[PDB]
Write a protein that binds this ligand. Structure first.
Ligand SMILES: O=C(NCCCCc1ncc(CO)[nH]1)OCc1ccccc1
Length: 305
């Protein structure tokens, strides 16, 4: 139908501190969760079946991301490292050392030969997956880096920071192509490219999401009605059914907007803390949501539309 009807199917309990992020494997079979409890957990995407725990970080994890082939994870930790994991064995393949403060955010490129990382140390780093070596250090921002994402062909990196900037980097050279948002405030708490790489979805800590045309460098859409003044809350493009924007909120709800109309089409109620992270299943109308330390659970929601 014209609107989604997401309904709770499973609650996934196990993390002992705040959940930090959830991501669906590109092949659709798994959900990965990261937590302040220093653990990665793997769950069945369709039945919420707990699969395994992946251990090794010495401090809390802020982010976890999947390789294109669904075989590897990368995690970003307060221990100042990233770890590349073999999902099948649960083994740490590489520890990426270089950041001088907490690593907050990470992603593979589509090729999954590189990792990008953002840190409290105000830098973005680009890592070789095979060797685990740092290839480039970008002096990207003047405050913690909130998010990092590659575009569809891997040629660009978008970064955001508490410095109030969103910047787009040339992957090959590490040089800045443009500063898309250039305000002193508010903090830009999240950014990512649209699936086709033409747009950037950006969250600011004034309870606002915006969709930007990258090439033109102007705002096409604004989404409001949720609460976001404190946390780096993820936002998603939902594309399997109706074309939505999905975001957690500091009022403990998941918000779903019509992308084109900007109307709120659903609020998912159930979490008992801030919903820090949502993910959209790659083929099914399924949302995963995760909450901070008063809740510590992941919820799987399913919609007919
Ligand atoms: O949002 C949080 N922590 C909650 C868990 C991590 C959530 C997260 N990881 C990656 C993303 C988006 O790329 N979002 O910290 C905000 C903060 C910042 C600076 C000083 C105090 C507090």
């Amino acid at each position: 139908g014209s609107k989604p009807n997401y309904a709770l199917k499973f609650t996934l309990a196990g993390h002992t501190k705040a959940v930090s992020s959830v991501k669906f494997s590109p092949n659709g079979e798994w959900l990965a969760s990261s937590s302040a409890d220093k653990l990665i957990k793997i769950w069945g995407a369709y039945d919420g079946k707990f699969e395994k725990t992946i251990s090794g970080h010495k401090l809390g994890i802020s982010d976890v991301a999947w390789s294109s082939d669904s075989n590897l994870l990368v995690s970003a930790s307060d221990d100042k490292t990233l770890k590349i994991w073999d999902v099948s064995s649960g083994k740490c393949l590489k520890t990426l050392k270089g950041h001088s403060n907490y690593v907050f955010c990470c992603n593979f490129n589509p090729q999954s030969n590189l990792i990008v990382s953002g840190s409290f140390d105000e830098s973005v780093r680009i890592w070789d997956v095979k060797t685990g070596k740092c290839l480039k250090t970008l002096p990207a921002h003047s405050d913690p880096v909130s998010a990092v994402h590659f575009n569809r062909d891997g040629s660009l990196i978008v970064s955001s920071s508490y410095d109030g900037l969103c910047r787009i980097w040339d992957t090959a050279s590490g040089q800045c192509l443009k500063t898309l948002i250039d305000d002193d405030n508010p903090p830009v708490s999240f950014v990512k490219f649209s699936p086709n790489g033409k747009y950037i979805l950006a969250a600011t800590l004034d309870n606002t999401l915006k969709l930007w045309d990258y090439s033109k460098g102007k705002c096409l859409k604004t989404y409001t009605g949720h609460k976001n003044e404190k946390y780096c809350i993820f936002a998603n493009f939902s594309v399997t059914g109706g074309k939505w924007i999905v975001s957690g909120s500091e009022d403990n709800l998941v918000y779903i907007w019509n992308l084109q109309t900007k109307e709120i089409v659903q609020k998912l109620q159930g979490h008992t803390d801030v919903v820090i992270s949502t993910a959209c299943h790659p083929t099914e109308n399924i949302i995963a949501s995760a909450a901070l330390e008063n809740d510590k659970t992941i919820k799987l929601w399913k919609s007919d539309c």
